[PDB]
Amino acid sequence: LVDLGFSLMESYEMPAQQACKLGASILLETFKVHEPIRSDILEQVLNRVLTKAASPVSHFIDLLSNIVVSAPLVLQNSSSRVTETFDNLSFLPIDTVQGLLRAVQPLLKVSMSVRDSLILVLQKAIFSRQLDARKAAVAGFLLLLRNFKILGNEAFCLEILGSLRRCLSQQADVRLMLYEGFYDVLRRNSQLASSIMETLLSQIKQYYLPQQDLLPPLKLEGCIMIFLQEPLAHLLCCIQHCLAWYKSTVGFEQNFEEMLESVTRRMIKSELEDFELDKSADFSPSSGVGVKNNIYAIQVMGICEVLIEYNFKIGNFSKNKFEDVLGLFTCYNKLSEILKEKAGKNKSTLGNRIARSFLSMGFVSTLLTALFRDNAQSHEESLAVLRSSTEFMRYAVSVALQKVQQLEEMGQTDGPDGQNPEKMFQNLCKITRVLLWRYTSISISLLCLEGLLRIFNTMQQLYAARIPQFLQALDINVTEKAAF
Amino acid sequence: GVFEELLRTSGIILKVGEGQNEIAVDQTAFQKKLRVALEKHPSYPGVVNEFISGLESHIKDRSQFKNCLLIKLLLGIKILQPAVVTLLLEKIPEFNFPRLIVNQFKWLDGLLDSQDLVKKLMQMLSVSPVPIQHDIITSLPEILEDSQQNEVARELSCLLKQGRRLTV
DNA sequence: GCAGCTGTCTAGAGACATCGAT
DNA sequence: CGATGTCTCTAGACAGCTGC
Incomplete structure (x- = not known):
C-alpha cells in the first residue's frame, strides 16, 4: 500500500488530480490504522516532499497536516526528523513554508527542541x-508569533x-x-500589541512631517531608491486596521488618533496644486523620472483609500466625516x-477596473449594507449627498469585485480576516443580498450583477461543502431554494 | 571613568578580565535603568563628552572586548552611534580574534552612517591579512540590510575584477 | 457654408489546427 | 515532444456619408 502511494505521488507529475486525491486518501488510511509502519509513512512523505517544486506539490503539505492532526506524536516517535526540512527556504518558500509551519504548529509548541x-x-x-x-x-515570522x-x-x-x-x-x-500579517498576531496579544503600535507609530513618524495643516506631507522622495523603498499605502492600511482593533479591544494613542485625524484634514486641504504631480503628462514609461511619478501616483491612491476606511469607521452617522470621505474620493478620482x-x-x-484596493472585506460589507438596504432615523442625511457621487458608487462596488476576484483566482484576499474561510463566508452571505437588492432596486447594477456571478462561481469552486447555509442565507433541500 | 561609574549605578560591574557579563538578563528594566542613568546624569555637552572619554578609557582594554563575546544596550543612545564604530575599529586589529565582533555584529544593524562606514571598511580591508579579509568580504551583506544595493554591487564587482584569487 | 452623423479599419484578446521536432 | 500563427470576434476611431 505505501509503495503504491509513493509511486502514485511520483506518477502524478483531471485524472492526475484524482490520482493525487486517491493517493492522499490511501496514505492517510494506512497511516491512521497501521501502528508500526506510520513512522515509515512519515519518513516516506518527508523524503518525497523535498526536491519537488515544478509540479503542484500542495498535496504533500495537506496530507501531512491531516496525518499530524490525526496523530501528532508520530514526529516525536520519528525523533523529530523535521529539523532537516528547514533548508527549504531556498527551493520554493512562497506557500510551502507557510503550510508546513501550519501543519507542524502543535508539535513545535509541545516540543522545545524543534x-x-x-x-x-x-x-x-x-x-x-x-x-x-x-x-x-x-513568512516564518508571520507564523511563529501566533505559534505561542x-x-x-x-x-x-x-x-x-x-x-x-x-x-x-x-x-x-x-x-x-x-x-x-501584523493584524493576525495583533489579534493575539495585549501589551505586545502596545509595543507593536509604538513601533509602527515611530515608523510612520518618518514620513509624517508634523506641520499642522499646511503643504502636503509627501516624503515620497525617500521611496525612490525608479525604485520604491517603503509601501506607504500598506503601512497606512495596517495602521488603520490595528487602530480599529485596539479601539475595539477596550498616551500615544491619543496622539495616534489626532495625527491620523490631522492627515485626513490635511488631504482635504491639499489638492492637486500643492502636489508635485500637477502636470497631466509628467509620467513617462521607460524613463528615470516618469516611473518615479508613477510610483508616487500609485502610492497616494492607496493613501486616500485607507483614510476612507478611517473616517467611515471613526465617525458614526456624523455628517462632518462623510464630507471628508467625499473629499478623499474627490482627490482620489481627480487623480486616478x-x-x-x-x-x-x-x-x-x-480589462480590470479601479486599481488594487487596500480596503477591508468587513468595511466594504458595512459600507454597502449601510449605503443600500438601510434607511433609518440614525441616517443623518449624509448618504443623501453621498448618493449624488455616482463615481463613488462605481468605485464602492468595484473594490468588492476586486476582492472576490482575489477569492476567484486565488484562495485568499486582502484586509483583515482574509484566511478564515467562515469569516468571508459570512461576509459573502451578507454582501450578496444587498448586491441582489441593488440589482432588484430598479452602469452601476452591471457591477453588482457581475459580482453575483463571481460569488456563485466562488461558492461552488471553493465553498462546496458550505453551500447549504449560503443557499439558505439568501432568505433542507438545495434544489427548491436553487430553483427559487 | 565616568562610563564606569554610570555602569556602577546602572550597567556592568567594574571587572576587567575574562569573566562573564555582569548584566541583568532582561531588556525592559535593566535596559530602561541604563537609559534613565544615561538621561539623568549626562544632560550637557561637557558631561556627555567626559562620559565618552570614560567609555573610551574603559572599553579600550582587550579584556573588556573578550568579555563582550552585549553591545545593543550601548547603541540604544544616539551619542554612542559612532562610539561603537570606533570601538569596532579598535577591536579589528586583534588577529585569527575579530571573529567575535564579526559574529557580534550579526543580528545587529545599529549604525551611524552606513554609506561612509562601507568605504571605511574597505579602507581597513586594504591593510588586512587574507583570512580576515575573506571573512569581512563575506560580511559585506551582513552590515547591510538591502538598502545600499547599487553601490555595494559596484564595489563588490570592483573587488572581483581586482582580486581573482580571492573570488570565493 | 462648411457644420453633423454614420462604419469600415484597425488593434485586443482568446481558442484552435499544425505548427515543428525535443 | 508543443511555441506559434491564424482566425470568429468585439469596439473605437476618425473619417466618409450623411448632413449644413
Missing part, C-alpha cells in the same frame, strides 16, 4: 540579503518584539507582507480617473 531549531534557522535566515531568503524569513499564545514565559513575549522592527529597515518588497489611465497606463484597454 522550536529552538526553528528560531535559530529563522534568525540566521533573516539577515541573509537574498530576496527569497528574506521572504522565507518573514498568552492572550488568556514573558521573556519569550518581549524578546521577539525587536526582530520585525529590525527587519523593517529592508526593502519595500520585504516590507510588504509584515503590514498585512485622469493622469493615470490617460498617460500612466491605458494604451491597452483595461
Whole structure:
C-alpha cells in the first residue's frame, strides 16, 4: 500500500488530480490504522516532499497536516526528523513554508527542541540579503508569533518584539507582507500589541512631517531608491486596521488618533496644486523620472483609500466625516480617473477596473449594507449627498469585485480576516443580498450583477461543502431554494 | 571613568578580565535603568563628552572586548552611534580574534552612517591579512540590510575584477 | 457654408489546427 | 515532444456619408 502511494505521488507529475486525491486518501488510511509502519509513512512523505517544486506539490503539505492532526506524536516517535526540512527556504518558500509551519504548529509548541531549531534557522535566515531568503524569513515570522499564545514565559513575549522592527529597515518588497500579517498576531496579544503600535507609530513618524495643516506631507522622495523603498499605502492600511482593533479591544494613542485625524484634514486641504504631480503628462514609461511619478501616483491612491476606511469607521452617522470621505474620493478620482489611465497606463484597454484596493472585506460589507438596504432615523442625511457621487458608487462596488476576484483566482484576499474561510463566508452571505437588492432596486447594477456571478462561481469552486447555509442565507433541500 | 561609574549605578560591574557579563538578563528594566542613568546624569555637552572619554578609557582594554563575546544596550543612545564604530575599529586589529565582533555584529544593524562606514571598511580591508579579509568580504551583506544595493554591487564587482584569487 | 452623423479599419484578446521536432 | 500563427470576434476611431 505505501509503495503504491509513493509511486502514485511520483506518477502524478483531471485524472492526475484524482490520482493525487486517491493517493492522499490511501496514505492517510494506512497511516491512521497501521501502528508500526506510520513512522515509515512519515519518513516516506518527508523524503518525497523535498526536491519537488515544478509540479503542484500542495498535496504533500495537506496530507501531512491531516496525518499530524490525526496523530501528532508520530514526529516525536520519528525523533523529530523535521529539523532537516528547514533548508527549504531556498527551493520554493512562497506557500510551502507557510503550510508546513501550519501543519507542524502543535508539535513545535509541545516540543522545545524543534522550536529552538526553528528560531535559530529563522534568525540566521533573516539577515541573509537574498530576496527569497528574506521572504522565507518573514513568512516564518508571520507564523511563529501566533505559534505561542498568552492572550488568556514573558521573556519569550518581549524578546521577539525587536526582530520585525529590525527587519523593517529592508526593502519595500520585504516590507510588504509584515503590514498585512501584523493584524493576525495583533489579534493575539495585549501589551505586545502596545509595543507593536509604538513601533509602527515611530515608523510612520518618518514620513509624517508634523506641520499642522499646511503643504502636503509627501516624503515620497525617500521611496525612490525608479525604485520604491517603503509601501506607504500598506503601512497606512495596517495602521488603520490595528487602530480599529485596539479601539475595539477596550498616551500615544491619543496622539495616534489626532495625527491620523490631522492627515485626513490635511488631504482635504491639499489638492492637486500643492502636489508635485500637477502636470497631466509628467509620467513617462521607460524613463528615470516618469516611473518615479508613477510610483508616487500609485502610492497616494492607496493613501486616500485607507483614510476612507478611517473616517467611515471613526465617525458614526456624523455628517462632518462623510464630507471628508467625499473629499478623499474627490482627490482620489481627480487623480486616478485622469493622469493615470490617460498617460500612466491605458494604451491597452483595461480589462480590470479601479486599481488594487487596500480596503477591508468587513468595511466594504458595512459600507454597502449601510449605503443600500438601510434607511433609518440614525441616517443623518449624509448618504443623501453621498448618493449624488455616482463615481463613488462605481468605485464602492468595484473594490468588492476586486476582492472576490482575489477569492476567484486565488484562495485568499486582502484586509483583515482574509484566511478564515467562515469569516468571508459570512461576509459573502451578507454582501450578496444587498448586491441582489441593488440589482432588484430598479452602469452601476452591471457591477453588482457581475459580482453575483463571481460569488456563485466562488461558492461552488471553493465553498462546496458550505453551500447549504449560503443557499439558505439568501432568505433542507438545495434544489427548491436553487430553483427559487 | 565616568562610563564606569554610570555602569556602577546602572550597567556592568567594574571587572576587567575574562569573566562573564555582569548584566541583568532582561531588556525592559535593566535596559530602561541604563537609559534613565544615561538621561539623568549626562544632560550637557561637557558631561556627555567626559562620559565618552570614560567609555573610551574603559572599553579600550582587550579584556573588556573578550568579555563582550552585549553591545545593543550601548547603541540604544544616539551619542554612542559612532562610539561603537570606533570601538569596532579598535577591536579589528586583534588577529585569527575579530571573529567575535564579526559574529557580534550579526543580528545587529545599529549604525551611524552606513554609506561612509562601507568605504571605511574597505579602507581597513586594504591593510588586512587574507583570512580576515575573506571573512569581512563575506560580511559585506551582513552590515547591510538591502538598502545600499547599487553601490555595494559596484564595489563588490570592483573587488572581483581586482582580486581573482580571492573570488570565493 | 462648411457644420453633423454614420462604419469600415484597425488593434485586443482568446481558442484552435499544425505548427515543428525535443 | 508543443511555441506559434491564424482566425470568429468585439469596439473605437476618425473619417466618409450623411448632413449644413
